[PDB]
Paper text:
To elucidate how BAF binds to the nucleosome in the presence of H1, we performed the cryo-EM analysis of the H1-BAF-Lamin A/C IgF-nucleosome complex. The structure revealed that H1 binds the dyad and linker DNAs, forming a “chromatosome”, and consequently eliminates the BAF-Lamin A/C IgF complex from the nucleosomal dyad and linker DNA regions (eand Supplementary Fig. 4). In this study, we used H1.1, which reportedly co-exists with BAF, for the cryo-EM analysis. The overall structure of the chromatosome in the BAF-Lamin A/C IgF-H1.1-nucleosome complex is quite similar to those of the chromatosomes containing H1.0, H1.4, or H1.10, although a slight difference exists. Therefore, the H1 subtype may not affect the BAF-Lamin A/C binding to the chromatosome. On the other hand, two BAF dimers complexed with the Lamin A/C IgF domain symmetrically bind to the DNA regions of the chromatosome at the SHL ± 7.5 and SHL ± 3 positions, and connect two chromatosomes. Therefore, BAF is capable of compacting chromatin together with H1. In the structure of the BAF-Lamin A/C IgF-H1-nucleosome complex, the distance between the nearest main chain regions of Lamin A/C IgF and H1 is approximately 8 Å, indicating that the globular domain of H1 and the IgF domain of Lamin A/C may not directly interact. The linker histone H1 competes with BAF-Lamin A/C at the nucleosomal dyad and induces nucleosome bridging by BAF. Meanwhile, in the chromatin regions with linker histones, H1 or another linker histone probably competes with BAF-Lamin A/C bound to the nucleosomal dyad, and may promote the BAF-mediated nucleosome bridging.
Barrier-to-autointegration factor (BAF) associates with mitotic chromosomes and promotes nuclear envelope assembly by recruiting proteins, such as Lamins, required for the reconstruction of the nuclear envelope and lamina. BAF also mediates chromatin anchoring to the nuclear lamina via Lamin A/C. However, the mechanism by which BAF and Lamin A/C bind chromatin and affect the chromatin organization remains elusive. The fundamental repeating unit of chromatin is the nucleosome, which contains two copies of histones H2A, H2B, H3, and H41. In the present study, we show the cryo-electron microscopy (cryo-EM) structures of BAF-Lamin A/C IgF-nucleosome complexes with or without linker histone H1.
Residue numbers in the entry:
A (entry chain f): 20 to 102
B (entry chain b): 25 to 102
C (entry chain h): 34 to 124
D (entry chain d): 31 to 124
E (entry chain e): 37 to 134
F (entry chain a): 38 to 133
G (entry chain g): 15 to 118
H (entry chain c): 11 to 118
The structure:
Amino acid sequence: KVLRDNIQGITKPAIRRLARRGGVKRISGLIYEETRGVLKVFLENVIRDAVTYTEHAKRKTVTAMDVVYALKRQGRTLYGFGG
Amino acid sequence: NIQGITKPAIRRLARRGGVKRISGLIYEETRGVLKVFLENVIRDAVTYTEHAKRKTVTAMDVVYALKRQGRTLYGFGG
Amino acid sequence: KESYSIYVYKVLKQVHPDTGISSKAMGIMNSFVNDIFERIAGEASRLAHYNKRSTITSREIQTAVRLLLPGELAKHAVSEGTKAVTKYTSA
Amino acid sequence: RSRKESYSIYVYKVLKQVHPDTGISSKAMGIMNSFVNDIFERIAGEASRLAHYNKRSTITSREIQTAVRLLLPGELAKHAVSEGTKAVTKYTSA
Amino acid sequence: KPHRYRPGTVALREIRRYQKSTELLIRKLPFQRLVREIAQDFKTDLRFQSSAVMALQEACEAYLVGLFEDTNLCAIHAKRVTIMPKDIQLARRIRGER
Amino acid sequence: PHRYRPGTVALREIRRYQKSTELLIRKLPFQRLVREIAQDFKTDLRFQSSAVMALQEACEAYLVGLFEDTNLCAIHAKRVTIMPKDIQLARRIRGE
Amino acid sequence: KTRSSRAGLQFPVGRVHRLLRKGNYSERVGAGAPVYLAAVLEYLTAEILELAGNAARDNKKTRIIPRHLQLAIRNDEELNKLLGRVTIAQGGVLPNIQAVLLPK
Amino acid sequence: RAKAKTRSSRAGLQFPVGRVHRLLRKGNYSERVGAGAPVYLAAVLEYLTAEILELAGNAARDNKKTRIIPRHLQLAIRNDEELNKLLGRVTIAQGGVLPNIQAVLLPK
């Protein structure tokens, strides 16, 4: 199936919980669209590099190491998935 | 000598950045910030120089000290 | 020592036939060419090392360019590289 | 089939050295593996760039000492440099 | 007569609870479908190891948490308690992401 | 006499300095500051002149960027005058 | 009869290959890699210099000075993203004043 | 033919000097790797692991658990200033955040 408009999957209470973790107490009502936009942009940036690494090795599977490397490029190292 | 960074000089630096009105406590804060940054650059420059057994802190050492911290500097390379 | 002054000058004459470039701007362009070369080579090194390979073919440079350069610059540079390699190989 | 190398057991031995009566789960071992690899890659890469600036072609101990001075900030610099010097001296005397 | 906390206390209880736990905060399947949707824009017919999607989700959650911490600092700076889209945009613009 | 209302001379200075590019810190005070700071790590250091030039260019660019971000913070809080709290917030968010 | 002449490039393919070998970037360097790398460098330099030449003619001068490079770099989205952390000596800044500061 | 003892035993180190030397040689960091560099590097790695593990063990003791889990490593890393500075950017999986609420949020 062709997958479209799944960005609504990030439910409003999910962003609420995320902010509650960060120490935020009162959330506006327009935060939700803005945060979905920011998340979409960040995911595009990570997955572009992950897919690039994967295509380079002539594979059709985006392993965890590709994503760890794509993050490592953008200055956010991720400990725990490297194997 | 940190008082060498004269108040009109900091005023000019702010003017370049698009600032319009400057408080009065700002000057001491900027002197502190500049002191910290200069320490963190000169420490690495001096470490590079001490490594190569030189007593002269050449320009490439300062360029490398910056390049480590992410603030690449063009024009002196070198 | 050795720099890219004359090459930058030739390219400048190729795009703007009647423009000159001062000394300090030439120094800046030298540093910029070295900087981009180091970024691309470093990415090629890391990439050939991930796949347990050992040889920086054109493919690794292509992928490193795809990674570092953002947006349409990537597509244009990749086109240039492929065309240049093809012209060199067939001739 | 195919072996995989990791610093799991060495981390375990060091843990027994500092805290004689504390275990550590598998995921914390994953984090410590990745951390040791991260620090090693930082230090070795910095030493390589440094030994390449001076047109040398060998990572002697001096390069590792200078790289540790650059990377580790503050008290860790002095303590790690002292540990390195002690290890090298005790290694060479035998 | 009914039990009904003043607006503000339930927020603090939730803040303590979610700062004490560590589980993931976004439901797994919506995020997985989002990841596949985005990936299909670049090259079609890609397959994702489950650990890879988990790593992606961990990175996204950590990024959003950091973003909201900095946004909250910005909002408190303006002598408010509510965070607003201009707060997020300022936090990102200072961080250098835009 | 003839005298501008405050604010306009600030704008004229803003445009004048954003048009030009010369250094904004007098050279000798900065040189003596650099030597003073380096005097605590190595005692007999002699700086190449261009090294001090590069140090000064880096410091000016860093401070200009810092004041740009501080100005964004200040305008955020419905003010026009920056304050030490603005600079502290900018540095805190930047990651320092 | 030079490799740069074969590939129709302007940058030196030989020097780029020599640099790849001398820098310890890998054990072995393939034959097409220096050619591709020289082509990429040539294209990036051409892009920057074309933008700088435009910005130089836009203020009535026939020579490029670092202020021009700063303008060309910061006035294009992609190049600005590529050189986001780089400080250019003698650069100044892009002329930009916040709207709120402007009177009325 | 002599009783060969591992280099880690010679240098009084737990970390495996042979493995570190092998990684330096195969990682293409330089053409020729000195004999003292792997020893020095293994010592530094051991010291850093010891530091983090001691702090994490203390933090695990404080909340009355007897096994280190990623939350404990996060709490140990973020609560020491110098270790925080060394590991400023790194995101720990299954890590959570530091318990911290802004004062102005709390009611006056």
